[PDB]
Design a protein that fits this description.
2 copies of one chain form a homodimer. With 304 residues, the first copy, chain A, is of the alpha+beta class. In chain A, strand 9 and strand 10 form a beta hairpin. Chain A has 3 domains: 112 residues, Trypsin-like serine proteases (Thrombin, subunit H, Beta Barrel), CATH 2.40.10.10; 85 residues, Thrombin, subunit H, CATH 2.40.10; 104 residues, main proteinase (3clpro) structure, domain 3 (Orthogonal Bundle), CATH 1.10.1840. Chain A has 8 helices and 13 strands. In chain A, the strands form 2 sheets. In chain A, strands 5-4-1-2-3-7-6 form a 7-stranded antiparallel sheet, with no helix packed on it. In chain A, helix 4 runs parallel beside helix 7. The structure holds ligand MU3 (2 copies). Chains A, B: 3CL-PRO exists as monomer and homodimer. Only the homodimer shows catalytic activity. Interacts with host FBXO22; this interaction promotes the proteasomal degradation of nsp5. Chains A, B: It comes from Severe acute respiratory syndrome coronavirus 2 (2019-nCoV). Chains A, B: It is found in: Host cytoplasm; Host Golgi apparatus; Host nucleus.
Chain lengths: 304, 304
Amino acid sequence: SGFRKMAFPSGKVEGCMVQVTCGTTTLNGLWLDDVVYCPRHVICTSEDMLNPNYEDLLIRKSNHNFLVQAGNVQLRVIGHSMQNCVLKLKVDTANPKTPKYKFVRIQPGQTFSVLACYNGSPSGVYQCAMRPNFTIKGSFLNGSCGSVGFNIDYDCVSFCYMHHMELPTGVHAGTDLEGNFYGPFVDRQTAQAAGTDTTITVNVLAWLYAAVINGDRWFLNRFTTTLNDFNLVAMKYNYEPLTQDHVDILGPLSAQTGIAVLDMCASLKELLQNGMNGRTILGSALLEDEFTPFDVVRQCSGVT
Amino acid sequence: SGFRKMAFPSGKVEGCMVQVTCGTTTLNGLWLDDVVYCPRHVICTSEDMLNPNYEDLLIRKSNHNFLVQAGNVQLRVIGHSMQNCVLKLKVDTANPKTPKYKFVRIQPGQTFSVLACYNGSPSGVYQCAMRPNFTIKGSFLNGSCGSVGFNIDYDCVSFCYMHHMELPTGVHAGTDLEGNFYGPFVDRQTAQAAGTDTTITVNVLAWLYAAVINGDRWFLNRFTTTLNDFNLVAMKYNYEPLTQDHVDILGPLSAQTGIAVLDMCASLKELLQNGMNGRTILGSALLEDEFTPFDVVRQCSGVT
Ligand SMILES: O=C(Nc1nncn1C1CC1)[C@@H]1CCOc2ccccc21
Ligand SMILES: O=C(Nc1nncn1C1CC1)[C@@H]1CCOc2ccccc21
């Protein structure tokens, strides 16, 4: 037993990280097959970032201007193109360590692991969630751009995020592996404020089920509620509305614990209205929302 | 910016995980060079666990009784020995993926990454701290024994923990890689209760410095304190006493932020006495103690 904020094993993704340098700018690239993917802002000077015309800035770059280093060896760039906000650098060597992979665009509320990298080298791995305002709360310093977010289904890595930037509020923004930003963010040094960071209700409920499975049961009460009544309280507390689709997704956890989804909603409603009173749930003093129902089942069943 | 509970990249350790089976029992082993290390309780039936005589149970086991599988290939066991609570299985093939490594015994308060495994296969990675009562609060189900804890210094993995058991309270116990348990725990299905789980003061202070570096400054106050005054409050709150050695260790973080260590102690003293008042620090509603001062510097500087 025990329940931790767990990231996927990062080995398969470490095998893909390379360093990409264009002029004075060094960031990370993701090498899969014979393509290296990286944020297109690698072509910018800090001055260009204020109002960059990427097509125009790219005209001044040739294949030999993109320096790609995998470990201590240089890769030969034989082609380059821009797809949305990412560059795809075609190299002459397929990555021998390329795992089975997919490029997926995730929905808000979905979690993933980030392998934070600097100069093509992994520094650490942590678990993130795509927030309902399409930001992530990561740990990214200068040089971390191009680090990726992913999930793993046994031996297939599904890449869902590439890090591009930090907003003035300290929250993070990035793209899927097709270069499309999550949310309304743009790769420009301009005023960009994030919307409301609501709490991912279905994930909190999943985590309350993990707490029950792992023996923390003090918050269970004698009440029930309805989706409509629960959502009135969820609205007041800046929680995402709970839908019948979320109820269906929590079905397996409801079955495992014998606690009906709406009874768990009533427990959550009381926790919102009354607070924790100085108590903790799975070592947390706040309601955790960065575990999906699938993450809870995965961790509680020991999937590899 | 941003500060996350980050684990080390796990690739180097994934390359070492194997499955070990003895009779009906399957757990994990750590394959380094031509030796596979695993918990000695792999030789026990659930019945033997109540009062096992490991030397006697081991007499009934031969090299061919230890089935070691690395991926989908079987390893040949050419020797076996017991060192404290671990078995060392000599195999005929050195692990080709053996990283540079050390075996270290850590002190309470030190953190490490755990690569949770089942049947020699990695399921996830998370960050732990050796608690002051020599337990860890992990996420370990049946089959996870033999999963290891480690730290990495660039390319050298220092293995510090091997998982052996779960106490009736749901907390975890294990050994260093020489097979010596942390704390007073024994590998026997008997009443073993953990002592007081005090809070690792030096780690909380390090995390308050990370909060200041990452822009969360509301808790900074106009006060200072002394080590003796602070420790009177630390004692009342079940916090570890702060020593001049801890003050020295926090020196670099004090320098980076310009906040004297004793002023940060005074901020912590007020947080203990007054609570958070519904506010958060780095997204937490409790004072986090599973980041060492070295972890804070490492993460805030982007070490790879
Ligand atoms: O935010 C950036 N880098 C970054 N992403 N996460 C952390 N970091 C560094 C800690 C800042 C850079 C800085 C200059 O302005 C822009 C504009 C657009 C895209 C990227 C950037
Ligand atoms: O605790 C154990 N296994 C375990 N370690 N973490 C999680 N788990 C399983 C979730 C229980 C086993 C169970 C039988 O009794 C003993 C006695 C000594 C050593 C190991 C064990």
